[PDB]
Amino acid sequence: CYVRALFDFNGNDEEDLPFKKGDILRIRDKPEEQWWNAEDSEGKRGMIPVPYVEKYG
Numbered sequence: 001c002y003v004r005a006l007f008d009f010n011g012n013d014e015e016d017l018p019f020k021k022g023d024i025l026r027i028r029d030k031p032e033e034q035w036w037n038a039e040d041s042e043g044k045r046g047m048i049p050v051p052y053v054e055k056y057g
Contacts, residue, residue, distance in 0.1 A: 005019040
C-alpha cells in the first residue's frame with residue numbers, strides 16, 4: 001500500500017504530490033494509469049507518478 005518515488009519533485013502545479021528521489025508514498029487510489037492518489041510522509045494525499053514511483057506495499 002505504498003510506492004517508492006525514485007524521482008524528486010517539490011513544487012506546486014496541479015497539487016501533484018511532491019517528494020524526493022527515494023521517497024515513499026502510500027497509494028490508496030489508482031484512478032489514472034500513471035497518476036495515482038497516494039499519501040506523503042505526513043498523510044497528505046496527492047497525485048503520485050507511477051512511472052516515477054515503484055510498487056512497494
